[PDB]
Amino acid sequence: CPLMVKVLDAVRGSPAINVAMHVFRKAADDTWEPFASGKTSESGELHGLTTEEEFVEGIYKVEIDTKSYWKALGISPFHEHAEVVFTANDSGPRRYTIAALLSPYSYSTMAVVTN
Amino acid sequence: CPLMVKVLDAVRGSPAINVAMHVFRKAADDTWEPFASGKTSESGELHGLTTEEEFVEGIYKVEIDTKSYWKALGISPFHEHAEVVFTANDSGPRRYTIAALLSPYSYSTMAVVTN
Amino acid sequence: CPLMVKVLDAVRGSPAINVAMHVFRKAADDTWEPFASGKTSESGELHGLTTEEEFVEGIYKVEIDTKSYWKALGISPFHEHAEVVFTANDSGPRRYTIAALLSPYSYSTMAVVTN
Amino acid sequence: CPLMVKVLDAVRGSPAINVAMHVFRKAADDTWEPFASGKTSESGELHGLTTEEEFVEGIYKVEIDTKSYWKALGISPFHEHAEVVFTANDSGPRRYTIAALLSPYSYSTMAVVTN
């Protein structure tokens, strides 16, 4: 699998578990088409979203549902979601690891891109 | 004005100058409608996007055109743009400051909400 | 004054008020000597730590007393304090703004150096 | 091993390889005693710094040598090092994963603490 997402909780110092996320891919008509979705495990990671064959070049958006995550922990956060928008595989296949670090009023996102 | 955006460049250690950004409000049909836009100043700030009268409760999105900023610097970036999506709520008097810290493969965003 | 420090709280979405900080300069014997100190204001800022005359080239450390800030809020933190260690260099006229974004198990720091 | 450090480079979107770090432990006389040291591998991780037996309760400091890392890549960064100071094992043994995300003028650090 060439796309993995890892989410961490900066309030608890732990993986962010059961975080839902939705991946979209921009279509020829410039609309966002649903591509894949899932939720993080006990390790805060979401594996198996796609395959090398299906993950063609394109513009992808990973929408991490942070508001639902915080609300279930009793926190009313600032953001609706954390978004990561990027062009993938523009120069051939790559493996992408997207990491998100969450706090109620802030988030950081990092991508590790390997060949 | 109740909304200000500040953008910083973690590669140069400076304000991110001349960064374009577009603000959208979620409409009835669940689509994003243009609301305001501009480019950051020499201080990396964008003031005067809206007014207390126009900035009613709702869901807003701030799209920061980070890829165009890094291309102008000759640095290959990961993200197409940075997005900050949030709900504006009238829980007494409020001012919103959205800060974005940019790096080529990472971004951090923070929201300061004050009375 | 050529050095300013700003501290923000990512749990509350606010300036971090009344945070103590201590600034040190590295001495001849390679030890850290007190140089300046204070507490952040209602805006989360600490101005007037030093002057152009006193702030000569050298290695400085800013220790931000974050654990005491989180204890006052009743939140269990990871770090004892945050540290920012850097060299001040006279490469023409300069102003240094050190920003710190705090969460209980994470911290981010940024330096804006301007002419 | 109850202590692991992972370092990532936000300019390249990759693990930060060959990053040296030194761990210190505060002694009874309030001085920092050398505890362990090593450098990150190709994955940006440093494993095997200590054992459950040697990693007793105390105040530890992980000094990550970021300036040397950036200089070898042709960048003159702001910070001398990234520091992580924390009390370990105060409520019994824990496993600590410290993550640092580096840019030339900024760094973020996160700790995942597990039982």
From Swiss-Prot, chains A, B, C, D:
Effect of residue 85 to A: In a patient with amyloidosis
Outcome (variant: residue 43 to P): In AMYLD1; amyloid polyneuropathy
Transport as UniProt keyword: yes
GO cellular component: azurophil granule lumen; extracellular exosome; extracellular region; extracellular space; protein-containing complex
Mutation effect (residue 64 to V): In AMYLD1; amyloid polyneuropathy
Note, other: Tetramer dissociation and partial unfolding leads to the formation of aggregates and amyloid fibrils. Small molecules that occupy at least one of the thyroid hormone binding sites stabilize the tetramer, and thereby stabilize the native state and protect against misfolding and the formation of amyloid fibrils. Two binding sites for thyroxine are located in the channel. Less than 1% of plasma prealbumin molecules are normally involved in thyroxine transport. L-thyroxine binds to the transthyretin by an order of magnitude stronger than does the triiodo-L-thyronine. Thyroxine-binding globulin is the major carrier protein for thyroid hormones in man.
Disease: Amyloidosis, hereditary systemic 1: A form of hereditary systemic amyloidosis, a disorder characterized by amyloid deposition in multiple tissues resulting in a wide clinical spectrum. AMYLD1 is an autosomal dominant form due to transthyretin amyloid deposition. Protein fibrils can form in different tissues leading to amyloid polyneuropathies, amyloidotic cardiomyopathy, carpal tunnel syndrome, systemic senile amyloidosis. The disease includes leptomeningeal amyloidosis that is characterized by primary involvement of the central nervous system. Hyperthyroxinemia, dystransthyretinemic: A condition characterized by elevation of total and free thyroxine in healthy, euthyroid persons without detectable binding protein abnormalities.
Function: Thyroid hormone-binding protein. Probably transports thyroxine from the bloodstream to the brain.
Protein's name in the database: Transthyretin
Source organism: Homo sapiens (Human)
